[model samples]
Target: MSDQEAKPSTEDLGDKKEGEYIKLKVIGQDSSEIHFKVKMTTHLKKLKESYCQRQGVPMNSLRFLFEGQRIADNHTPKELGMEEEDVIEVYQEQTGG
Candidate 1:
């Protein structure tokens, strides 16, 4: 009498890997480029906050613009048709006290 054990099938590893993440460049008024990767489903507010924090600036002190349009807090990268290597312009808001 002989018994055979089921073996695991070989998985096909492929490069059909669509880029689910986009590398965004946040350009500051000082001409500084901050690069980071974010998922398509991620909200843009996170990026804004992180950039402000990184530069020791307040969140409301700057504006985030993409492709000549302002970015909203509820907007995601995919919603804005953002692609890899896209540049996000960040400008400081001026206020007179």
Candidate 2:
């Protein structure tokens, strides 16, 4: 038998449910929250992009925060140690120039 078999992706490895869905709420300004779900291995950027698309907001017009830290687009909730029902706060990012 040959070695070097294909490895499972992060999504196929660790998730709370099938395909690793992480259902959570995104708290926007004025305490209004948007309930949504995402794959555990999904990148933060995709989440932000979808949020902006669904809400008719501009991409790069807001910031996503988790526990007071601004999260980067490259990371996922699972990678960030986020859990179900964890609150991700969204705030407007100031534009310069």
Query: Mind giving the per-residue lDDT tens digits that candidate 1 earns over 1-97?
Result: 3759864555645444334777878887867667788886778888877777787776576677886777866778888887778888877784221
Off by over 4 Å in 2: 1-18, 30-32, 95-97
lDDT of each: 0.74, 0.72
Candidate 2 lDDT score at position 91: 79
lDDT of 2 at 38: 79
lDDT of 1: 0.74
